[PDB]
C-alpha cells in the first residue's frame, strides 16, 4: 500500500525540504509534510493495478487476418496495433511468456499451425506442409470454445528487444536492417479452415504473462507510421503534388493563452 | 570540487553536482552466472579504461543538439578502439563527463541524457531503414541540425528533430533516462556513470550501439553583457570495466 500521511505542525527549519535542484538528475523527495501542515490519514490505497504484470497482462489484440481462400498467415508481432505497441515501448527490454487466444467468426473446423522459425510455412490450404510431424498444431471448432496456448519466452537473449540501436550485418553490407526486425522472430501462425461455413475474420488476442520489464523509456508522443521502424513523419498523400510534405501526428494540444487556463 | 581518476587520466571539476550513477548500478565485470561464451575474455583495465575526450562542439544560438553513439564514438580512440575492432564481442560500462562553462553573465541549459538503445527514426516518409554510416559517425557525433521539411532524405538519414528525441518520444520525458542538466547559472559539468545495459552479456561493438549520449540546448545561450555568442561543449567518455572476448582479425576494410 501507499504510505500514510504523517502529521506535521508549523516548522521553522534552516534546511529547506523544498528547495532542491533540477540539475542533479534526481527527482524530489518532497512530501506534503514539507509544504503544509498535514494531519494523519490512513492510506489503504494500492498501486496493484499499476505493476507491469497488471499493466501489460491484459490480452491485447496483436494482429488481425482475413482468410482469403480458406487460408490466413500472420507473423507474430506486437507491431501492427498501436495501443499495445505504445505500452510495450514504455520499456526497452521485456521478457514475457505469451498466451495466444484466437477469436474467429468462422463456423466450422479450423487449424492453427505455429510454424517455428527457420522452415517453410504452408503457402495455402490443402498444401502438403500442413501434414507435419513436429510443427505444433492446434485443431479446434470455433463454436463451443476459443483456442488458447502459451508460447513461452523464445528469445535468444535474456529479453526481447523493444528497441535495438544496431544492425544485423557489418559496415560494408547493403541490405542492413536497423531495429528489432532481425533480433527476434516469434514464428508465425498459419490458419486454415477444413470447412467452409462461417466468416473469414480471425483476431489474435495475445496476453503477456510472467513479465519482467528492464529499462523504462518515454511514452511515445506521436502516431506510428510503419512497423519495426519507429518513424513518425507521416506521408499522407502520395499522388497529389503536395506529396513530399510530412505530417507530425502528435498529441500536444494548444491553449489560447498561458496564465489564463 | 570533484575528482575522477581512471588510469592514465584524471577529471577535475569545481562547480559540480552529484555524480549520476545510471540505474543505481556500477559497471561490473561479467559474472560466470551471466556469461554465455566459453572463452576467457580479455581485460585491458588500464589502457582502455581511461578518459577519452572527443571533439568539442560549439553551442551557438540556434544549435538544436548533438548526439554520440556508444561504443561507436570510441572506435578510433586508443586501445579501447583497437580491442573493439579486433574482437567479436565486448561489454563496457562508461563514465561520461560533459563540460561546458561560460560565465556568470551567460544563460542557458543543456539536458545531457544517456539513452539505452536509441533507435533513431528515419528523417521522414517511406519505409526506409536508416543507414549504417549515419548512425555511426564516430567521435565527431551528429549535430542535430533541427527539423525542417527540406531536410535531406538520401540514404537513410536519421531524424533531425530534437523535440521528439529523433525516435518519436517527447523531450522532457527524456528525464526517465540517466540525465543531468548543465544550467550555466549553477553548474558547468555533468558526470554520468553508466553500467553495461543490454539484454545479452556481450555483443559486437561495431554492429550494436548500446548507449547514446544526447545533449540538447533546452534553453538558448544568451551572451548577456559579454560579446561571446558561442561556448564549446567537450565530452570526455571513459570506458569502465570493459572486457572483450572472441579475438579475431581486425574488422576494418
Amino acid at each position: 500500500v501507499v504510505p500514510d500521511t504523517k502529521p506535521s505542525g508549523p516548522q521553522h527549519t534552516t534546511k529547506p525540504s523544498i528547495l532542491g535542484a533540477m540539475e542533479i538528475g534526481a527527482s524530489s523527495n518532497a512530501t506534503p509534510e514539507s509544504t503544509i501542515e498535514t494531519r494523519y490519514v490512513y492510506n489503504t490505497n494500492t498501486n496493484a493495478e499499476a505493476d507491469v504484470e497488471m499493466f501489460l497482462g491484459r490480452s491485447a489484440l496483436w494482429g488481425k487476418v482475413t482468410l482469403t481462400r480458406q487460408y490466413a498467415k500472420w507473423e507474430i508481432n506486437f507491431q501492427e496495433q498501436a495501443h499495445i505497441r505504445k505500452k510495450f515501448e514504455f520499456f526497452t527490454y521485456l521478457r514475457f511468456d505469451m498466451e495466444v487466444t484466437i477469436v474467429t467468426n468462422n463456423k466450422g473446423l479450423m487449424q492453427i499451425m505455429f510454424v517455428p522459425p527457420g522452415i517453410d510455412h504452408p503457402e495455402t490450404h490443402d498444401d502438403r506442409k500442413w501434414d507435419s510431424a513436429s510443427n505444433p498444431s492446434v485443431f479446434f471448432q470455433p463454436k463451443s470454445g476459443f483456442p488458447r496456448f502459451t508460447i513461452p519466452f523464445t528469445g535468444l537473449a535474456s529479453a526481447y528487444y523493444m528497441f535495438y540501436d544496431g544492425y544485423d550485418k557489418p559496415k560494408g553490407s547493403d541490405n542492413n536492417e536497423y531495429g528489432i526486425a532481425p533480433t527476434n522472430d516469434m514464428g508465425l501462425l498459419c490458419f486454415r479452415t477444413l470447412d467452409n461455413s462461417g466468416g473469414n475474420d480471425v483476431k489474435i488476442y495475445v496476453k503477456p504473462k510472467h513479465i519482467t520489464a528492464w529499462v523504462p523509456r518515454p511514452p511515445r508522443a506521436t502516431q506510428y507510421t510503419h512497423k519495426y521502424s519507429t518513424n513518425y513523419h507521416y506521408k499522407p498523400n502520395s499522388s497529389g503534388p503536395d506529396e513530399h510534405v510530412l505530417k507530425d501526428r502528435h498529441f500536444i494540444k494548444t491553449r489560447p493563452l498561458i496564465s489564463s487556463a | 570540487l570533484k575528482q575522477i581518476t581512471i588510469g592514465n587520466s584524471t577529471i577535475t571539476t569545481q562547480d559540480s553536482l552529484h555524480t549520476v550513477l545510471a540505474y543505481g548500478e556500477w559497471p561490473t565485470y561479467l559474472s560466470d552466472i551471466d556469461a554465455t561464451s566459453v572463452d576467457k575474455p580479455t581485460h585491458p583495465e588500464t589502457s582502455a579504461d581511461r578518459f577519452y575526450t572527443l571533439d568539442s562542439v560549439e553551442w551557438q544560438v540556434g544549435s538544436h543538439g548533438w548526439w554520440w553513439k556508444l561504443p561507436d564514438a570510441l572506435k578510433d580512440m586508443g586501445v579501447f578502439g583497437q580491442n573493439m575492432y579486433y574482437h567479436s564481442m565486448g561489454r563496457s560500462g562508461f563514465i561520461i563527463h560533459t563540460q561546458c562553462n561560460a560565465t556568470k553573465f551567460h544563460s542557458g541549459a543543456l539536458i545531457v541524457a544517456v539513452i539505452p538503445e536509441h533507435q533513431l527514426a528515419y528523417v521522414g516518409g517511406v519505409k526506409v531503414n536508416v543507414g549504417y554510416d549515419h548512425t555511426h559517425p564516430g567521435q565527431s557525433g551528429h549535430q542535430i541540425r533541427g527539423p525542417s521539411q527540406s531536410n535531406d532524405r538520401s540514404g537513410g538519414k536519421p531524424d533531425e528533430d530534437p523535440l521528439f528525441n529523433c525516435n518519436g518520444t517527447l523531450l522532457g520525458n527524456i528525464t526517465i533516462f540517466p540525465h543531468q542538466i548543465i544550467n550555466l547559472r549553477t553548474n558547468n559539468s555533468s558526470t554520468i556513470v553508466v553500467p553495461y545495459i543490454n539484454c545479452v552479456p556481450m555483443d559486437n561493438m561495431l554492429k550494436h550501439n548500446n548507449l547514446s549520449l544526447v545533449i540538447i540546448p533546452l534553453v538558448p545561450l544568451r551572451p548577456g553583457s559579454s560579446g561571446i555568442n558561442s561556448v564549446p561543449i567537450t565530452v570526455t567518455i571513459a570506458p569502465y570495466k570493459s572486457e572483450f572476448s572472441g579475438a579475431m582479425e581486425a574488422q576494418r576494410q
Binding site: 542533479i24 511468456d97 502459451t150 504473462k209 510472467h210 | 555524480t19 549520476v20 550513477l21
Partner: peptide, 25 residues
C-alpha cells in the same frame, strides 16, 4: 494454487523506486 498443466509457463499472472528519481552516488 494448483498448476493444472505441470509447467511453469502454463501458469497465470505472477506477482524500489530509487534506481530512478535518485540515481546519485
Amino acid at each position: 494454487n494448483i498448476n493444472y498443466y505441470k509447467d511453469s509457463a502454463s501458469s497465470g499472472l505472477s506477482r524500489d523506486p530509487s534506481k530512478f528519481t535518485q540515481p546519485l552516488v
